[PDB]
RNA sequence: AUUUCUACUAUUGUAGAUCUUUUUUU
């Protein structure tokens, strides 16, 4: 089952030596130099923790309010596929982030309504709106979490004695950084103008004023406030990029000044310096007045103008993502201007203004000569078209004068214009009947108006089969309806034929596009040469202590690469490894450098960073992590385990008030080495080939079919077992191993730890003794643990007591394991939710008079049966239960939206136990799989039901916020499990990722076929069921939950594991 | 006590887990 694909890992190592007692001194051969380098790097690591917790809370509260406002506004607009339009560069970014093949788009501004093309059964616009919908749901989750944290934090600051409620500042930092990434992922595209609203000038205030206000917002303040907090967090516990080191000396000697002249040429093609010099120094309002004071037609028809000025005189078109910032820097620095005063000017080109909003705002300062030709033309044309059938607020004289100037004749008196007005009015009336969400009851009035409008249309020119469209539209009031309606739309939109202006904009836009694509390409190739900022080599002293000697790649001066490699000889005590590769193309070359050479290099200004790990630097240096094993296997020199030449070294600053012993009290650098597992046994599937396969659907279908054919042939004839993993009401998960005939197999021996103190304190150890024997594992509290004799055993962590205050060796263990009481409280929460579903009234009655916590517990004991442990109602989570019942109260107040209530009934309370319990479960499943010599099948639930049917919009990649199952009885039985959909889907995906890359002994095995990781659960929906309703995926067998139910095992919730394993046994036998 | 996560012990720590361009049009 050897892996034929190239795999990658990112091995991360520390780089700040922990000078402490109770930590073995390491890297002490060159320790002196290490110290110097550290105090060099602190000189660059800037920090000012001066922001008191009060001011941090002030900034956080303001940011939360702004983010909530923006999020509420955006929640109503992401799905407007008819108004949104993304630029080409951002469209490609979408097609990478969301996963769809971009196709070939003819236009620069790709309106989402024009992405009618299909891709694997869904429109291309549905992929984008689904990606935005998922982003919004995650924003909601993190806003809720961050609001709770901020509330507890400021409550703690209020009552100075109540410091116990201060949230863990680690989680505070991490939650805000995740929330800021989510928010910025949409605020940035709106801020710089990639997500645009091109129909903004035709729109009317009233029913669509919210969209206009959202199109005209200023996201400078919100973005700057998020930036303020991100800096504040990066100054007290936040990771902040330090360098990107390369280990190849041919990637470090490139000159980045090759492209310079070229870029300047393109800049002189845009006459940008003149524009920026003319505009810099003005405020945004002054720039607006300058642009609104230009002569529009004269500048547009003036061919000697820069294409930017002419475009802004025709249309609001922003400068792209990818050039703007680098262009501001590249314009400022040669000329000595302020960088920000130029970025402001480049932000001021393409700022949307709506003529209608301006006119409603003030009726005296209005004038149509302010706006570009297209915007003013659209406003005048559609307002004049609407004025023939409704009374509107704008005075027709200026619009008529504008159109008369454009065409040279009275536009409102042409038959073509009246025909356009009639078609538009018919479209407006048809829109009401085609919005089935809010159907009225006065259909007769609309139909009478529609008939009269069709009757009174006087066709200005001979148009063919128009009456066919008329009769179809009348007949419907269904596919023929849409066809005729769209053909009427084509005829209506073609009535403006003005064609001279658009013909000129053809050439203007072609030049504006070619020049900016040349700039973008030159910048992209320039910023992959200035990305690397150091050249480093790994160094081993005599005790296998590895340091990284990194020298600055000064672009302002000759670099030191030649002075590092002129000290590497063949006879010296320190070994040096440096990588040489080109993309059988890799070499890890070793030389030696003496101590005087390192001394001179470091005094010259280079950096020396220890590479620290718990196993690399322990007193016996036995490797027990996988990262340490891979570290010591990379430097064996082989080619099947490769080191990627460049890696990013970062750092995080200390948190105030933490002890220096803790890793959060120390300025901690981090190296991020990158390793490739590339086979040599034949033609390995290159990563590009993997990507191409992942894009193709049929390649995947053939691949999965052939892989499970390999498995079935290589395993069916041999003696194998079936490992069925199932959820549980009381047990988080449950594992049963059946024989291929169906008999229950396995007698697992569960152990128990105990720390025995030795007379010499340095040799204390945990002594494992057998405590239980079981044949159905309770995967909640187990963990696979290595005895000091070398054996691997399964221990039950709930059987051992822990200590109240840690680091009290003299005291005796009293408390209960924290994960155990977390699962206790999780079962209580599940009980509460199942009680809400059936007795929402008996749940809401719990808070009749704001009961005190003792009274709240007394009332809870009425509804929810106790856990059944030693102590009844021991660790009841009164706080979380109270803030879930109050949330249900708030939902049922504002109406009784069933979906909004299921957002609470199915909250998946196990989401903080996820990362910790799934690791244990993966460890145990790996242990049992490798116990039976990899000749075993895995048998898992198929969560596909929770993603609705084929009709539903959920393709699988994005988790539903609420389960979309059709049954109510089954959806109720799946809402009582400890592991929600998110938790159990996370476990399943982690297990598949684990099976894809099993490392048995210095080798990599594979049992699931080319599972594309970034696509969460489509890989399982897309599979083909056998005729027994089980989806085979390599070793794994995804079994539908509902169709696994039979006579109970002769031999409560372990029979579930037995029944999944038994159904897989039966299906596998019936296969052959 | 940690590259980091989780549960710990006080064992100079332990156990599992860990990545080219292309406008106006529905």
Residue numbers in the entry: 5 to 481, 487 to 506, 530 to 615, 706 to 1173, 1212 to 1232
Sentences from the paper on this structure:
Cas12a2 is a CRISPR-associated nuclease that performs RNA-guided, sequence-nonspecific degradation of single-stranded RNA, single-stranded DNA and double-stranded DNA following recognition of a complementary RNA target, culminating in abortive infection. However, it was recently discovered that Cas12a2 from Sulfuricurvum sp. PC08-66 instead relies on abortive infection—that is, dormancy or cell death in response to the presence of an invader—to achieve population-level immunity, preventing the replication and transmission of plasmids. Cas12a2 adopts a bilobed architecture, with a recognition (REC) lobe comprising the REC1 and REC2 domains and the nuclease (NUC) lobe consisting of the PI, wedge (WED), RuvC nuclease, ZR and Cas12a2-specific insertion domains. To understand the unique mechanisms of activation, substrate capture and indiscriminate nuclease activity underlying the function of Cas12a2, we carried out biochemical, structural and in vivo analyses, including determining cryo-electron microscopy (cryo-EM) structures of autoinhibited Cas12a2–crRNA (binary complex) associated with an RNA target (ternary complex) and bound to both an RNA target and a dsDNA collateral substrate mimetic (quaternary complex).
To gain insights into the function of Cas12a2, we first purified a binary complex consisting of catalytically active Cas12a2 and a mature crRNA and determined the structure using cryo-EM to a global resolution of 3.2 Å. The quality of the map allowed de novo modelling of most of Cas12a2, aside from the flexible PFS-interacting (PI) and ZR domains. Of note, seven nucleotides of pre-ordered crRNA sit at the interface between REC1 and REC2 in a conformation in which bases are solvent-exposed and primed for target recognition. This region is towards the 3′ end of the crRNA, and the intervening sequence between the 5′ crRNA stem–loop and this pre-ordered guide is disordered in our structure, probably owing to flexibility. Our structure suggests that Cas12a2–crRNA–target strand (TS) duplex formation may initiate and propagate from the 3′ end of the crRNA, enabling Cas12a2 to target phage that have escaped surveillance by Cas12a through mutagenesis of the PAM or 5′ seed regions. Inspection of the RuvC active site in the autoinhibited binary complex reveals that the catalytic triad (D848, E1063 and D1213) is buried within a solvent-excluded pocket. In the binary complex (Cas12a2–crRNA), the active site is occluded. The 3′ end of the crRNA is a pre-ordered seed, and the PI domain is flexible.
